[PDB]
Amino acid sequence: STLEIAGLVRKNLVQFGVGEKNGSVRWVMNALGVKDDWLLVPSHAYKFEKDYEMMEFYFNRGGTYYSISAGNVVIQSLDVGFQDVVLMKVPTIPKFRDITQHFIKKGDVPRALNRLATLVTTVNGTPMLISEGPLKMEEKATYVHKKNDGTTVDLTVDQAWRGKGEGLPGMCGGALVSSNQSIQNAILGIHVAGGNSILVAKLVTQEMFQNIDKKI
Amino acid sequence: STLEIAGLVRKNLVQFGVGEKNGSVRWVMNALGVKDDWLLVPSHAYKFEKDYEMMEFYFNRGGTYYSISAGNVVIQSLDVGFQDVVLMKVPTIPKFRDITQHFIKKGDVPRALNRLATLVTTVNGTPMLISEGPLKMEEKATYVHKKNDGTTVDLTVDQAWRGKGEGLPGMCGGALVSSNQSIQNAILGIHVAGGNSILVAKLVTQEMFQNIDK
């Protein structure tokens, strides 16, 4: 049931923030824990910051704050091309329950195409469930992002799901869940953009998780 | 409660008019004082007149009409836009009680969503309280209003509240108050346009007034 898998997701969802050690912190969106000390994070959460070298990442795991230097995390791309969503290893965060086997398998993709799905996310800390229309998929989809107030750059997403629905700023990073019980309400991917009245998310499959169990 | 916050809004509401320095004043809608000499004004109140040369802006505060020339007003934005609602400083106008801290905080918007709200406004001095349907939010909302006289215009709103309710001409500029007691019945925004059974208001947050007190 949508609510069963939604609860698993909820338990692994954390608030993601960026800043300088001993300085100011800006909470930006969400990041999803997937296994042991590995999480999925949308790249625009940190891409447009002025100085990556002295960047510190901040996580809020149910009221406990953890932090790590950007120079101490291991990053892994899901695929080749524009960095849209990445896998990030955080050693100082508590072990996450393995939910890898709940994501959709590369082969099961058409069985999720054309149906409804639910976005399981949080807005500034408050849990929300957003309904998305019949999902379509696009090989490469574009959206517009605004740097904290002002400028607007165009960014693309590779292999994106398209749902119709109204957003709310800060929803980025949530997990998309299919309503198809035939495929065990698989997790389809991560929310990256919302615009006119269309919600866009990147497809993330069971196969993008192989390199994480390899030693170094 | 809703009555307490509604009271704070009424005391800061004034009428907005346009006219020449030695003629008759055309009153058009309401404006809301937020702090000191600053006011929240819907931009359609003045943006469709093309002779800024002899134009005076008028404000009725307690029976006295205060004015300022188009060529003298300081106008400021809330996010980056100007097509919907603007802040306007009028040095000549008597000081307004600071109500900024009664507006909703950004991180609390989800708690105002799906709940009822009350619109506090005036139509020619006449006070009105209007219940608005369970509120919904929209990224951008388009409304084509006959607002002028017989002229129709496009009014597009960024981050807008949409709700079921009934209107009247001249209600524009009034404020939306939340029925949610756990967020202290926060002011949610400013009424921009209304027509059949839909009312549209712009979202205004506490954080938005950072631009003025500095």
Ligand SMILES: [Cl-]
């Ligand atoms: Cl009440």
